Amino acid sequence: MASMKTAQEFRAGQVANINGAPWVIQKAEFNKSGRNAAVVKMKLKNLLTGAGTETVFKADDKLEPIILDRKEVTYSYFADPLYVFMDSEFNQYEIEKDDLEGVLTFIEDGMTDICEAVFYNDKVISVELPTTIVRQIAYTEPAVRGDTSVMKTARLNNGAELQVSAFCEIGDSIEIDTRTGEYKSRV
């Protein structure tokens, strides 16, 4: 699917075919001692088995980059045990709990957030929410009386609990950074 390129052209998050398996690059570091041939040290993770390894390539070593399938999907419903997502042409995908890290804490019935699903030949590699999402507060206590100059706990509709601003009220909408799972603003 993609033409070969040299080891020095790969960066983190790209994927290389090594022995016929897809390995994602977790880290790459280029080195050249004066006028000796340059090399590249890579930390790699095999997308099919989970195995990690670190190795050094010649900078001009040829490797086939792998092109993962990326699709926008929305969450549809929970069959049990699998989670059903759907793309814009109405194709369904059944996804295991184990492949929904990050996403799972904010999954809710009727979720409208467009997720990005990443595939290698009909194996799911990752599902990720938008970097910012909006959620309604299901339950929170009124602000405490007394300060000295912060956060209080809130429940979302799906049962998740989060620290939010002390001025937050039941029914308010909050922006959430999905990278960290943390509150950022009321909206």
UniProtKB/Swiss-Prot annotation:
NCBIfam families: efp, PRK00529.1. GO terms for biological process: peptide biosynthetic process. Pathway: Protein biosynthesis; polypeptide chain elongation. SUPFAM superfamilies: Nucleic acid-binding proteins (SSF50249), Translation proteins SH3-like domain (SSF50104). Changing R35A: Abolished arginine rhamnosylation. Involved in peptide bond synthesis. Stimulates efficient translation and peptide-bond synthesis on native or reconstituted 70S ribosomes in vitro. Probably functions indirectly by altering the affinity of the ribosome for aminoacyl-tRNA, thus increasing their reactivity as acceptors for peptidyl transferase. It is found in: Cytoplasm. This is Elongation factor P. InterPro entries: Elong-fact-P_C, NA-bd_OB-fold, Rib_uL2_dom2, Transl_elong_fac_P/YeiP, Transl_elong_KOW-like, Transl_elong_P/YeiP_cen, Transl_elongation_fac_P, Translation_prot_SH3-like_sf. Belongs to the elongation factor P family. Glycosylated ar Arg-35 by EarP: arginine rhamnosylation is required for EF-P function and rescue of polyproline stalled ribosomes. GO terms for cellular component: cytoplasm. Glycans are attached at R35. Keywords: Cytoplasm, Elongation factor, Glycoprotein, Protein biosynthesis. The gene is efp. Its main location: cytoplasm. GO terms for molecular function: translation elongation factor activity. Pfam families: EFP (PF01132), EFP_N (PF08207), Elong-fact-P_C (PF09285). The keyword Transmembrane does not apply.
